[PDB]
Structure formats: structure tokens, C-alpha cells
């Protein structure tokens, strides 16, 4: 034994041919079509309302359902191109958005557009948040955690992120949304129970996530049980391996409009 449902999922995923993998990875998931956004942004459209990444749709999914309620000064850790920061800036109660990402050679760089509220956004590349000192904020967002074929690596990278965000959470933001790349190992589930006892919130699987990642979002507006919410997600991803391939559900891409606040 000792294999976790998610660890069993990850092995199977590892044992899957390329062929099994790419019909699996989107089997039955929710998705936005980026074709129009990607073309407009390539051409230089800044006021067409496009999201700079699929990230805006994911945060929209959570905010549309109250899984979190951004407000005040938003900090966006690992902001990449900025999908979460620009989405944050359209929300009425939000007043300031500060995004930080590493950028450079292998890493997404911030994209400058003029979606609604763009003028309260500042994205800063060249920042390794692991060496950034924590600062107060009202809404704490973190979308760091890069996929790996090894679950030991994914655990390691998730633990590293979670230790870092502890210092930010100790400043007591009222709202938060933290990517947990690997929630599925025994160490992670225990760690996550402990964090939830101290800081509240709970885990949510965003259905725009692909079947090839077990990521879940630790959000201030959930009250869910760690073991049940993570195990439920492992069985979901296991069960989409055994059935025949399901179609993708598209939602509309986000229209972030345009204009200053
Ligand atoms: C792919 S994402 C950004 C997704 C974003 N939420 C959106 O909607 O566009 C996570 C980002 O974290 C950056 N990152 C990874 N490690 C980092 C670190 N130690 N410090 C700062 N940024 C990091 C990656 O380059 C990556 O672009
Ligand atoms: Cl990472
Ligand atoms: Cl990452």
C-alpha cells in the first residue's frame, strides 16, 4: 500500500502513453477558448477586453461563486503575464493590485494591456518571491507551482510555496486564493489540515484545471474538509481515465472591458 489515490493517479498518468495522455488531459474539463484573445494580443489590441492568460477565467470561476471576495490592496504572487491581476482590477471593492513574477529566461513576462482598471495595476518582473519580505495586504493571491512528473518534486515545490505564503498570511489578509500544486500526498494533506486550522479556508478544484494536474486552490471562502476534498478530486481524475473520452465544456472567455478607474 502507501500509494495515495492521487499518487496512484500520478503513476497511471506517468504510465500513460502520449496517446492516452492528450485525449485524457482535456476529457470532460471546462475551458475558455483563447483563440480570439491570443490573436488580438498578438496584433496589439489593448482595449478589446481580452484576458492576457487563461488565468483570468480561473479566478473568475472562483469569484463568480464567492469562493473568494477580493477587495482592497491585492498582492498577486507569481503573476506571470498578469491574468489574475487584471481580473482583480475589475472588481469594484478592489483598490490596488501589485503583481510580482520572476520572468526571465523560461518564465512568463507581464503583459501590458488596458482592460478595465488597468491603471490600478502594477506588475513587476525580475522578482523571486521566495526572497521577498512579506508585506501586508487585504487579498493575497498566489498561483505558483510548476508541474512535474515526480510527485515527490510536486510535494517539495508545494511545501516550499506554502512555507513562503505562511509569512504573508501571518499579516492577516481578509481574502486569499493560493494554488496547491500537489495536495494529494500524506505529508501535504496533514500540512494542509494544519494550515486550515490556523488560517481558515479550504480547498476547491476549479474545473478549468486540466485532468493532467491535481492542483487545487486554497481559498478563504471555502469550508471544506481537506481529506475529503482532495480524495474526491483524486477519484474524479481517476474516473476520467477509465471512461471513454468526454467532450470539453467551453465557457465564454472573460470580457474584462476597458478603461481607467
Ligand atoms: C503560470 S503562472 C501565472 C498565472 C496567472 N495567475 C495568470 O492568470 O496569468 C505562475 C508564475 O509564477 C512564476 N514563478 C514561479 N516561481 C516564482 C518565484 N519563485 N517568484 C516569482 N515568480 C515565480 C512563473 O514564471 C509563472 O509565470
Ligand atoms: Cl514551483
Ligand atoms: Cl509556477
UniProtKB/TrEMBL annotation:
Highest taxon, organism lineage: Viruses
Function (record text): Plays a role in virus budding by binding to the cell membrane and gathering the viral RNA into a nucleocapsid that forms the core of the mature virus particle. During virus entry, may induce genome penetration into the host cytoplasm after hemifusion induced by the surface proteins. Can migrate to the cell nucleus where it modulates host functions. Inhibits the integrated stress response (ISR) in the infected cell.
Localization annotation: Host cytoplasm, Host perinuclear region; Host endoplasmic reticulum membrane; Host nucleus; Secreted
Source species of the chain: Zika virus
Protein name: Genome polyprotein
Quaternary structure and interacting proteins, as annotated: Homodimer; in the endoplasmic reticulum and Golgi. Interacts with host TYRO3, AXL and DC-SIGN proteins. Interacts with non-structural protein 2A. Interacts with host HAVCR1; this interaction likely mediates virus attachment to host cell. Interacts with host NCAM1. Interacts with host HSPA5. Interacts with Aedes aegypti SRPN25, APY and venom allergen-1 salivary proteins; the interactions do not affect Zika virus replication in human endothelial cells and keratinocytes. Interacts with serine protease NS3. Interacts with NS1.
Record: residues binding S-adenosyl-L-methionine: 53, 83-84, 101-102, 128-129, 217
Lineage, highest ranks first: Viruses, Riboviria, Orthornavirae, Kitrinoviricota, Flasuviricetes
Domain MRNA cap 0-1 NS5-type MT: 1-261
Shown residues in whole-protein numbering: 2524 to 2784 of 3423
Amino acid at each position: 500500500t502507501g500509494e495515495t489515490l492521487g499518487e496512484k493517479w500520478k503513476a497511471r498518468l506517468n504510465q500513460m502513453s502520449a496517446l492516452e495522455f492528450y485525449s485524457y488531459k482535456k476529457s470532460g474539463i471546462t475551458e475558455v477558448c483563447r483563440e480570439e484573445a491570443r490573436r488580438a494580443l498578438k496584433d496589439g489590441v489593448a482595449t478589446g477586453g481580452h484576458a492576457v492568460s487563461r488565468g483570468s477565467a480561473k479566478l473568475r470561476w472562483l469569484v463568480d461563486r464567492g469562493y473568494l471576495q477580493p477587495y482592497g490592496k491585492v498582492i498577486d504572487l507569481g503573476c506571470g503575464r498578469g491574468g489574475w491581476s487584471y481580473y482583480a482590477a475589475t472588481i469594484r471593492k478592489v483598490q490596488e493590485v501589485k503583481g510580482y513574477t520572476k520572468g526571465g529566461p523560461g518564465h512568463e513576462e507581464p503583459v501590458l494591456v488596458q482592460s478595465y482598471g488597468w491603471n490600478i495595476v502594477r506588475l513587476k518582473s525580475g522578482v523571486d518571491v521566495f526572497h521577498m519580505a512579506a508585506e501586508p495586504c487585504d487579498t493575497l493571491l498566489c498561483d505558483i507551482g510548476e508541474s512535474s512528473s515526480s510527485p515527490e518534486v510536486e510535494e517539495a515545490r508545494t511545501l516550499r510555496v506554502l512555507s513562503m505564503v505562511g509569512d504573508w498570511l501571518e499579516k492577516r489578509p481578509g481574502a486569499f486564493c493560493i494554488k496547491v500544486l500537489c495536495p494529494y500526498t500524506s505529508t501535504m494533506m496533514e500540512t494542509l489540515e494544519r494550515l486550515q486550522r490556523r488560517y481558515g479556508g479550504g480547498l476547491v478544484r476549479v474545473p478549468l484545471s486540466r485532468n493532467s494536474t491535481h492542483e487545487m486552490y486554497w481559498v478563504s471562502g471555502a469550508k471544506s474538509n481537506t481529506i475529503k476534498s482532495v480524495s474526491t478530486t483524486s477519484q474524479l481524475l481517476l474516473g476520467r481515465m477509465d471512461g471513454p473520452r468526454r467532450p470539453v465544456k467551453y465557457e465564454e472567455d472573460v470580457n474584462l472591458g476597458s478603461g481607467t478607474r
